[PDB]
Ligand binder design. Structure first.
Ligand SMILES: [Ca+2]
Ligand SMILES: [Ca+2]
Ligand SMILES: [Ca+2]
Ligand SMILES: [Ca+2]
Ligand SMILES: [Ca+2]
Ligand SMILES: [Ca+2]
Ligand SMILES: [Ca+2]
Ligand SMILES: [Ca+2]
Ligand SMILES: [Ca+2]
Ligand SMILES: [Ca+2]
Ligand SMILES: [Fe+3]
Ligand SMILES: [Fe+3]
Ligand SMILES: [Fe+3]
Ligand SMILES: [Fe+3]
Ligand SMILES: [Fe+3]
Ligand SMILES: [Fe+3]
Ligand SMILES: [Fe+3]
Ligand SMILES: [Fe+3]
Ligand SMILES: [Fe+3]
Ligand SMILES: [Fe+3]
Ligand SMILES: [Fe+3]
Ligand SMILES: [Fe+3]
Ligand SMILES: [Fe+3]
Ligand SMILES: [Fe+3]
Ligand SMILES: [Fe+3]
Ligand SMILES: [Fe+3]
Ligand SMILES: [Fe+3]
Ligand SMILES: [Fe+3]
Ligand SMILES: [Fe+3]
Lengths: 62, 63, 63, 59, 62, 64, 67, 67, 59, 66
């Protein structure tokens, strides 16, 4: 398990987390809860872009 | 489920995620990768603060 | 490779899931004694969550 | 899942929680953390006594 | 890492889950002889639970 | 989507894993009294395994 | 921390779950050839279960006592 | 939510894991007769894998194309 | 764990992945997404064939 | 309760773990033919990852905007 492997693991986890945030926002009729989850999902998408950048830098094949 | 239970689940997951980020920062010998994981850990702790706030708002018994 | 803060986070995550279970089981019971047993368990677990959040804040500057 | 089944599940989870609290108390070097976990283990053991009693009453 | 008390707790937790499974299977069974089989197994496992609690209280003052 | 035979097989499989656990925990030792407790649990579980195999045999004509 | 008898018990437990899966898949199929494929697999796994029980009995005298 | 081909793929995947377990147990075993029991089980599970690959190729023309 | 066992693990994972891709193709709304998943399934079937060949040659 | 973008995210996450497995199995192998086999599988999976990230960007404007 090297650095690129840990980056891939973090990216995979972030993608699943976004899925969870979107599903939980959809399940709520509370506007404040939906806003909470939409903000979290946006911050997680930022993290995804950052991880993909690090992966492309560190992985030649990617 | 209901909203409070899903918030509790989100908080539990975020706490495990911080553990992972900090562990990966420790495991790396590349300083850039270490810094990446430390930055991720800091922002996830902010997410934890937000979630605890939501829980306190929505759970009278917790606040 | 875990430190004290990682173990506190794990305990807190487990407690949040435990509260979910207690409140669900309190709801699913129609026996007042059992519903009440589970409600008392959930209140005590919420107390544990507050204590663990305090520990986390006291040992983690990023939090 | 009836009431007695849910109590058995809670009791089993409480027993694993005690094991985890005691292991984490053993593993910590900060004394305050270490006592935090010991306090949690004592409280959970009291929970176990209550659950055993409830199980005896209903079963 | 584990000591005798921790192993006894694990055994007790497992026995409790086992009783739940035996009782659920008795409820779901069609053949009344199979139902009787699962009911008997549940009763014997409950006796084991009593014994495990006794051990745990002999070896743990708290 | 489980029938009676499938539940018997699940119970038998669980009992076999339980015996493994009792034997490993007896080996872990530390206290003779704890070892004897785990050994007694293992012996009674073996009784259950035999009865479950016989059940399976009457109910499963392909197994018998 | 496994000895030979524990590995035998583990194989037997896995085989029993596998038979459950084969019988369930045979029931869930509408193609008769696929149904028959799963039923044949189930019968062969049951033969393996018999062999595993014989091995367990030969290695575990306390278990053999109940047969 | 599963068709027959997906159930065949699941059975094949499980058989492959089962072979791994049997070969590992054969390597770990001390009694030569237990070692041989596990080797016997591994050889017969490999035969099942061959049979299931043939079934999958018969049911999945896209898979058969690559053989 | 030896080379043949790792090949078996890869093959078992690839078979589960094909199941997932076909399910997602059935479930998808957008035609391009359906086609994306079906194309992934086809490529994975090629990977399955390669792994079976390797396994037959080495075992 | 899954939409197309969620299924894309799930496939991408699975491919990333698959690449990890292929690379670790290449490292753990002593037979050069097996090692090259696993490296080849990893390269092809990485191409799959590029395709999926492109699909994700097209389906998720919030992700496209980074
Ligand atoms: Ca995450
Ligand atoms: Ca998270
Ligand atoms: Ca807890
Ligand atoms: Ca607990
Ligand atoms: Ca048990
Ligand atoms: Ca058992
Ligand atoms: Ca099997
Ligand atoms: Ca198998
Ligand atoms: Ca795959
Ligand atoms: Ca994959
Ligand atoms: Fe994150
Ligand atoms: Fe997050
Ligand atoms: Fe950021
Ligand atoms: Fe952030
Ligand atoms: Fe607690
Ligand atoms: Fe509790
Ligand atoms: Fe308490
Ligand atoms: Fe028992
Ligand atoms: Fe039993
Ligand atoms: Fe008994
Ligand atoms: Fe009996
Ligand atoms: Fe056979
Ligand atoms: Fe077999
Ligand atoms: Fe055979
Ligand atoms: Fe088989
Ligand atoms: Fe692949
Ligand atoms: Fe490809
Ligand atoms: Fe793929
Ligand atoms: Fe392509």
């Amino acid at each position: 398990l090297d650095d690129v492997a840990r980056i891939r693991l973090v990216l995979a986890r972030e993608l699943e987390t976004i899925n969870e945030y979107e599903a939980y926002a959809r399940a709520s009729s509370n506007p404040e809860v939906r806003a909470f989850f939409q903000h979290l999902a946006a911050e997680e998408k930022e993290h995804v872009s950052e991880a993909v950048h690090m992966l492309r830098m560190l992985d030649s094949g990617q």
